[PDB]
Amino acid sequence: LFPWAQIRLPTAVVPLRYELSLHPNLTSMTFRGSVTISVQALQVTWNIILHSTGHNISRVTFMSAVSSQEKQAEILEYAYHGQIAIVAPEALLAGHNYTLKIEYSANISSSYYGFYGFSYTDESNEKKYFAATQFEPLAARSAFPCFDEPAFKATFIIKIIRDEQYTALSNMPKKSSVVLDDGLVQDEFSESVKMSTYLVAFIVGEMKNLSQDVNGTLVSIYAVPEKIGQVHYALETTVKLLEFFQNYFEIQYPLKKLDLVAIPDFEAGAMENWGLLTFREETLLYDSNTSSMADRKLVTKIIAHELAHQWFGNLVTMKWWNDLWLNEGFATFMEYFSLEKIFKELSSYEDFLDARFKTMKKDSLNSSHPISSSVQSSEQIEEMFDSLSYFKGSSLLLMLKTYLSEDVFQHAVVLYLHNHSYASIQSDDLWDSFNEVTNQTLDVKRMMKTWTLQKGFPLVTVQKKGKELFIQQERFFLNTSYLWHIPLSYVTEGRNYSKYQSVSLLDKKSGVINLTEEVLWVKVNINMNGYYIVHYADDDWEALIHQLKINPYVLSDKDRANLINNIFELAGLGKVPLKRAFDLINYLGNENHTAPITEALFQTDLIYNLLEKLGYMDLASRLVTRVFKLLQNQIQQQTWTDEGTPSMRELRSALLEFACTHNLGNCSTTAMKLFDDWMASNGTQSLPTDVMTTVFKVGAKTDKGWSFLLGKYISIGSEAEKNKILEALASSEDVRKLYWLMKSSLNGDNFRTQKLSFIIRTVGRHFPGHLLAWDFVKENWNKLVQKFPLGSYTIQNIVAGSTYLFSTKTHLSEVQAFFENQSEATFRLRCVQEALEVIQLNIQWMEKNLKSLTWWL
Numbered sequence: 001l002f003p004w005a006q007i008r009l010p011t012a013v014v015p016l017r018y019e020l021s022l023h024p025n026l027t028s029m030t031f032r033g034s035v036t037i038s039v040q041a042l043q044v045t046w047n048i049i050l051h052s053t054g055h056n057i058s059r060v061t062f063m064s065a066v067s068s069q070e071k072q073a074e075i076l077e078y079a080y081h082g083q084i085a086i087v088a089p090e091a092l093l094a095g096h097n098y099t100l101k102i103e104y105s106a107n108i109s110s111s112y113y114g115f116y117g118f119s120y121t122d123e124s125n126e127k128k129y130f131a132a133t134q135f136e137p138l139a140a141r142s143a144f145p146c147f148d149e150p151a152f153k154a155t156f157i158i159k160i161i162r163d164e165q166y167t168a169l170s171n172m173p174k175k176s177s178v179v180l181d182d183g184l185v186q187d188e189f190s191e192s193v194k195m196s197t198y199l200v201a202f203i204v205g206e207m208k209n210l211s212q213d214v215n216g217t218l219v220s221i222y223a224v225p226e227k228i229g230q231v232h233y234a235l236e237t238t239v240k241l242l243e244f245f246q247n248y249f250e251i252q253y254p255l256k257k258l259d260l261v262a263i264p265d266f267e268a269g270a271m272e273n274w275g276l277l278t279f280r281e282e283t284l285l286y287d288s289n290t291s292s293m294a295d296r297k298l299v300t301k302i303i304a305h306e307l308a309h310q311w312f313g314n315l316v317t318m319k320w321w322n323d324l325w326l327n328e329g330f331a332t333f334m335e336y337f338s339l340e341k342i343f344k345e346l347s348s349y350e351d352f353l354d355a356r357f358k359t360m361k362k363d364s365l366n367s368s369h370p371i372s373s374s375v376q377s378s379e380q381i382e383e384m385f386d387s388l389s390y391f392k393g394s395s396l397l398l399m400l401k402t403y404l405s406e407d408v409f410q411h412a413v414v415l416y417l418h419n420h421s422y423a424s425i426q427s428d429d430l431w432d433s434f435n436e437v438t439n440q441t442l443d444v445k446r447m448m449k450t451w452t453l454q455k456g457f458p459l460v461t462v463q464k465k466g467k468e469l470f471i472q473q474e475r476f477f478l479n480t481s482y483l484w485h486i487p488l489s490y491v492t493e494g495r496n497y498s499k500y501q502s503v504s505l506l507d508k509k510s511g512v513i514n515l516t517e518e519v520l521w522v523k524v525n526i527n528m529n530g531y532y533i534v535h536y537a538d539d540d541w542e543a544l545i546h547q548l549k550i551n552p553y554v555l556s557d558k559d560r561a562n563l564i565n566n567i568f569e570l571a572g573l574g575k576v577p578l579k580r581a582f583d584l585i586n587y588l589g590n591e592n593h594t595a596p597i598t599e600a601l602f603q604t605d606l607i608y609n610l611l612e613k614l615g616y617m618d619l620a621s622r623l624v625t626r627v628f629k630l631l632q633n634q635i636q637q638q639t640w641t642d643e644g645t646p647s648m649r650e651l652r653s654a655l656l657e658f659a660c661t662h663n664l665g666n667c668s669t670t671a672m673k674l675f676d677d678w679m680a681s682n683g684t685q686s687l688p689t690d691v692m693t694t695v696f697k698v699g700a701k702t703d704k705g706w707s708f709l710l711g712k713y714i715s716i717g718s719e720a721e722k723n724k725i726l727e728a729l730a731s732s733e734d735v736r737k738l739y740w741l742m743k744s745s746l747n748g749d750n751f752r753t754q755k756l757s758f759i760i761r762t763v764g765r766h767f768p769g770h771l772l773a774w775d776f777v778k779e780n781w782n783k784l785v786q787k788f789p790l791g792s793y794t795i796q797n798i799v800a801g802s803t804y805l806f807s808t809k810t811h812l813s814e815v816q817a818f819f820e821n822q823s824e825a826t827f828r829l830r831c832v833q834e835a836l837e838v839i840q841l842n843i844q845w846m847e848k849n850l851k852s853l854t855w856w857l
């Protein structure tokens with residue numbers, strides 16, 4: 001009978017104001033409260049439709065706004081999409097605003113989705129408690145009934161009951177703090193700005209504060225009393241960023257408050273609820289001693305993403321979930337751009353390039369769907385939060401900032417903000433801004449529409465003849481394609497020391513570029529600022545390889561890695577014989593930059609770990625030796641210390657793990673001593689942070705070391721170190737222990753159920769548990785489906801890791817057979833069809849190139 005039989009809410013009635021009353025017992029885990037909301041209808045509507053999940057609706061009152069009288073209004077719920085309907089006695093007229101107030105009883109969330117409750121152990125055996133809210137993917141339908149759609153934005157005030165010890169907090173700063181009857185306080189806050197449903201936030205817990213307000217801007221990193229001291233790099237960073245993100249955007253923070261919390265749990269999420277920026281406990285903690293540079297990078301990065309959202313995604317709020325990549329892809333770029341401008345020493349470009357590399361090798365699958373995709377149901381909403389969209393969008397924007405000038409980019413942003421600020425937009429509205437900001441209204445951002453509306457990335461083939469280098473765009477294909485406007489870039493040094501670095505654009509299946517001179521070596525997608533792979537003719541490649549042998553530094557550290565990832569993935573599809581890829585990396589004896597080495601070790605090892613599971617253990621042992629032999633001089637020069645560039649230290653972490661995990665050199669010897677020394681201390685000695693994981697793994701093989709380690713995981717609280725140990729515990733070769741850890745984590749007896757994906761991933765990569773990991777998933781799937789969603793990131797990471805190294809048709813038949821028998825819904829999942837595709841492609845890698853490497857001896 002419910003009038004709106006469409007998922008998207010009615011475009012008629014509209015909210016203007018929001019006030020909220022709530023009573024959180026927490027101990028009961030039950031809560032009752034009142035809604036207060038303002039509506040100014042714009043089309044005549046007898047019925048009003050709003051969102052509402054699971055409450056006790058007691059009384060229903062309508063306000064005509066002509067008098068102080070309220071009026072009973074029969075209520076109807078649909079819930080399938082999740083809606084409620086008010087049959088107002090007085091029909092509605094445009095500009096005839098009315099008052100929305102309702103009262104509900106409800107149960108606090110057992111899950112970590114909505115208004116939820118979680119109990120935590122004190123330093124003492126005190127079971128203290130905490131509550132909060134996370135409703136980003138349309139969850140605030142529950143708790144306060146409302147217009148969950150991010151279009152219907154509004155101002156928000158919220159008043160809730162508390163206890164005196166509990167320091168309650170919310171989006172807006174505090175105003176009224178009365179003391180009611182029963183010895184219970186009712187803290188209140190100011191009216192929020194116009195904002196969407198999901199950015200709201202209520203939190204009630206026992207937390208201290210570290211503050212350092214600046215320029216009329218108050219910063220506070222609330223946390224549980226057990227820390228309130230490890231939250232200093234956050235403050236030092238979160239202050240410095242809010243200046244930078246203020247200067248670029250040329251808009252100040254609207255609120256006066258900025259509160260960065262620390263939800264004391266691990267099943268949390270990092271959101272950007274305005275004013276109170278939720279975070280997981282351990283997401284922000286760091287010591288200038290002890291913690292690794294990678295640990296420092298995550299805090300200096302996860303801040304920046306969540307921080308910049310307060311502007312982009314909070315002021316400007318997407319109308320629908322079509323452009324969640326608009327928010328995520330933007331701030332993720334700001335992460336690795338904010339870091340480059342201020343924290344340049346972190347060398348965060350090495351982290352950006354790797355993710356873009358890993359991104360492309362997942363986007364080049366048929367399972368990939370276009371970045372912009374129609375959304376009409378809840379599974380389509382939640383499927384849109386995949387990590388690939390966040391990063392592909394991060395690449396496209398970088399490509400645009402690479403093409404159009406960087407200040408042109410900045411001028412484009414501010415107009416995009418100010419014009420459509422405090423409001424809903426669409427993805428096109430960002431593009432329109434770029435055309436206006438461009439000096440010519442030419443270069444319409446339709447160029448972007450090429451990519452946003454179609455899956456996959458372009459493949460660019462470059463064949464050069466004299467002073468004419470040609471181009472031929474083509475789809476990356478596995479042995480549609482509706483064009484790609486491609487911001488091509490290139491560099492040439494054809495005359496001796498002649499330096500040419502330019503830009504172009506291809507809108508056609510073919511194109512050619514003129515060369516001012518005859519050039520000898522030429523590259524494309526300079527520093528890989530664009531989303532494409534560049535093939536060369538056989539001669540054109542062979543030119544570039546020689547330059548790596550002579551002066552490999554004429555290119556950039558970014559550029560070299562783009563070649564090395566590009567050439568290896570090509571040979572894996574038979575588009576180039578594999579031998580030339582190793583012929584390329586035969587320069588690696590004279591490289592001093594981390595990113596060229598990191599990616600090569602990834603592609604080298606992938607063959608090693610791939611060849612091993614098939615059984616050519618001899619060949620892979622020979623393969624790793626040659627890689628060692630090239631970079632051997634680099635390995636011997638490394639110091640087992642925590643000293644150097646954060647970039648430079650990253651190279652130490654990788655290279656050593658190579659030498660030790662393949663038992664190459666004295667890496668084994670120099671490590672085991674350390675583990676023996678560290679174990680002697682009851683864990684009370686300095687282990688260098690950068691080499692800690694390698695050393696833990698080198699010892700765990702010994703039953704003494706594994707026994708020593710497992711007890712330390714159950715004691716200490718440095719979860720970063722703790723997880724670093726847990727890696728090493730699963731790098732043993734006693735298969736018996738590996739079944740225990742997995743089986744333990746699944747029931748979460750001495751571990752926790754969350755960490756299970758770390759093991760099934762970890763056990764699979766190393767040969768001993770390769771066949772063991774898949775069997776745990778197969779034989780324990782129903783608990784993996786009872787203890788997780790069927791489409792969870794857990795499930796996808798597990799299914800990929802248990803299968804991504806297979807490379808026999810027999811294994812592929814077993815995989816597809818198992819899922820198919822389980823359920824048809826299980827078979828059409830993204831996580832499986834991707835993995836089946838990987839096994840097929842893995843088979844082709846052998847078919848295209850296995851025999852030639854067997855002769856490579």
Ligand SMILES: *[C@@H]1O[C@H](CO)[C@@H](O[C@@H]2O[C@H](CO)[C@@H](O[C@@H]3O[C@H](CO)[C@@H](O)[C@H](O[C@H]4O[C@H](CO)[C@@H](O)[C@H](O)[C@@H]4O)[C@@H]3O)[C@H](O)[C@H]2NC(C)=O)[C@H](O)[C@H]1NC(C)=O
Pocket residue numbers: 209210211212213
């Ligand atoms: C956690 O948050 C608390 C919140 O208060 C914060 O407390 C701080 O305490 C200092 C104590 O010195 C406050 O210092 C202020 O000094 C100015 C003048 O320099 C005063 O105006 C302030 O209030 C006084 O004056 C008011 C005049 O209208 C009176 O109405 C009032 O009763 C006071 O007499 C106050 O003395 C400081 O303002 C607060 N707040 C902050 C953000 O510093 C505490 O510091 C925070 N935790 C940490 C670790 O910083």
Ligand SMILES: *[C@@H]1O[C@H](CO)[C@@H](O[C@@H]2O[C@H](CO)[C@@H](O[C@@H]3O[C@H](CO)[C@@H](O)[C@H](O[C@H]4O[C@H](CO)[C@@H](O)[C@H](O)[C@@H]4O)[C@@H]3O)[C@H](O)[C@H]2NC(C)=O)[C@H](O)[C@H]1NC(C)=O
Pocket residue numbers: 512513514
């Ligand atoms: C330097 O590189 C530039 C690229 O910026 C390139 O200039 C281009 O040369 C081609 C020559 O083929 C031009 O292409 C023509 O464009 C006109 C535009 O109206 C078309 O009508 C033509 O159509 C057909 O012509 C041929 C048959 O007569 C076909 O073989 C051809 O495939 C077409 O189907 C044709 O496309 C292009 O306009 C220019 N663009 C500019 C900006 O100059 C040039 O090749 C390089 N420099 C030199 C000196 O060659």
Ligand SMILES: *[C@@H]1O[C@H](CO)[C@@H](O[C@@H]2O[C@H](CO)[C@@H](O[C@@H]3O[C@H](CO)[C@@H](O)[C@H](O)[C@@H]3O)[C@H](O)[C@H]2NC(C)=O)[C@H](O)[C@H]1NC(C)=O
Pocket residue numbers: 024025026027028161162163184
């Ligand atoms: C949720 O409802 C429960 C009742 O079901 C409330 O429990 C009450 O909690 C308060 C403190 O939160 C207790 O008061 C304390 O008593 C001790 C011992 O006398 C005293 O030392 C403390 O200073 C404090 O006064 C109270 O005893 C307890 N109720 C009962 C019957 O024992 C709870 O407060 C409610 N929570 C919220 C957020 O409203």
Ligand SMILES: *[C@@H]1O[C@H](CO)[C@@H](O[C@@H]2O[C@H](CO)[C@@H](O[C@@H]3O[C@H](CO)[C@@H](O)[C@H](O)[C@@H]3O)[C@H](O)[C@H]2NC(C)=O)[C@H](O)[C@H]1NC(C)=O
Pocket residue numbers: 415419420429432433436
């Ligand atoms: C500020 O915001 C306004 C809207 O609030 C922007 O207006 C939009 O401006 C573009 C400029 O080209 C218009 O594009 C044109 O749209 C028509 C209809 O689709 C199309 O036929 C044309 O070819 C062209 O694409 C656009 O329609 C217009 N409105 C909307 C709803 O998109 C304005 O550009 C923003 N910026 C500034 C600096 O004002």
Ligand SMILES: *[C@@H]1O[C@H](CO)[C@@H](O[C@@H]2O[C@H](CO)[C@@H](O[C@@H]3O[C@H](CO)[C@@H](O)[C@H](O)[C@@H]3O)[C@H](O)[C@H]2NC(C)=O)[C@H](O)[C@H]1NC(C)=O
Pocket residue numbers: 553592
């Ligand atoms: C890794 O090894 C390469 C090997 O070439 C190093 O390149 C060298 O870099 C230094 C520092 O920039 C250059 O020193 C100066 O270069 C400028 C030209 O940019 C020149 O005008 C100066 O007279 C001086 O030579 C050096 O030239 C350059 N090598 C060559 C052969 O030109 C690179 O710096 C090393 N990186 C690290 C981190 O060690």
Ligand SMILES: COc1ccc(-c2cc(OCC(=O)N(C)Cc3cccnc3C)nc(-n3nc(C)cc3C)n2)cc1
Pocket residue numbers: 112113136137269270271272301302305309312313314324327328382385
């Ligand atoms: C690398 O470091 C980062 C990067 C990103 C984040 C991040 C996390 C986040 O939470 C989304 C979220 O967890 N669910 C909607 C919950 C959910 C999803 C699916 C199924 N069931 C449930 C309960 N949301 C965001 N943001 N922010 C904006 C403006 C838009 C988005 C998507 N970013 C954290 C840390």
Ligand SMILES: *[C@@H]1O[C@H](CO)[C@@H](O[C@@H]2O[C@H](CO)[C@@H](O)[C@H](O)[C@H]2NC(C)=O)[C@H](O)[C@H]1NC(C)=O
Pocket residue numbers: 054055056105106107
């Ligand atoms: C709170 O959760 C309970 C849990 O099911 C919801 O349902 C009640 O559940 C209990 C325990 O199983 C049953 O004994 C009752 O018969 C259920 N009914 C009622 C009326 O609560 C309950 O619906 C939830 N609270 C609200 C307000 O929906």
Ligand SMILES: *[C@@H]1O[C@H](CO)[C@@H](O)[C@H](O)[C@H]1NC(C)=O
Pocket residue numbers: 056057058105
């Ligand atoms: C909820 O409201 C109903 C309305 O009929 C009332 O009878 C009931 O006592 C309330 N409580 C619960 C727990 O549903």
Ligand SMILES: *[C@@H]1O[C@H](CO)[C@@H](O)[C@H](O)[C@H]1NC(C)=O
Pocket residue numbers: 016040095096097
């Ligand atoms: C309320 O409605 C009137 C007309 O009745 C309209 O002019 C006004 O803009 C609305 N504003 C508020 C704040 O409710």
Ligand SMILES: *[C@@H]1O[C@H](CO)[C@@H](O)[C@H](O)[C@H]1NC(C)=O
Pocket residue numbers: 214215243
């Ligand atoms: C405060 O703002 C002014 C103007 O933007 C600027 O000169 C100054 O550096 C800012 N200082 C801090 C600490 O934010």
Ligand SMILES: *[C@@H]1O[C@H](CO)[C@@H](O)[C@H](O)[C@H]1NC(C)=O
Pocket residue numbers: 288289
């Ligand atoms: C460890 O950090 C503390 C706190 O900042 C600092 O005072 C101390 O000097 C550091 N330890 C060493 C050995 O430098």
Ligand SMILES: *[C@@H]1O[C@H](CO)[C@@H](O)[C@H](O)[C@H]1NC(C)=O
Pocket residue numbers: 366367368369
């Ligand atoms: C590729 O994926 C699309 C959905 O995006 C699907 O319709 C099609 O059947 C798939 N094709 C292959 C060959 O996997």
Ligand SMILES: *[C@@H]1O[C@H](CO)[C@@H](O)[C@H](O)[C@H]1NC(C)=O
Pocket residue numbers: 636665666
């Ligand atoms: C390993 O130990 C032997 C001890 O004789 C030594 O000769 C060798 O130099 C050591 N390792 C390296 C990397 O040099």
Ligand SMILES: *[C@@H]1O[C@H](CO)[C@@H](O)[C@H](O)[C@H]1NC(C)=O
Pocket residue numbers: 682715
């Ligand atoms: C070693 O450390 C553990 C964990 O703190 C503790 O239980 C044990 O008593 C310690 N033993 C010695 C000899 O220090």
Ligand SMILES: [Zn+2]
Pocket residue numbers: 305306309328331
């Ligand atoms: Zn985000």
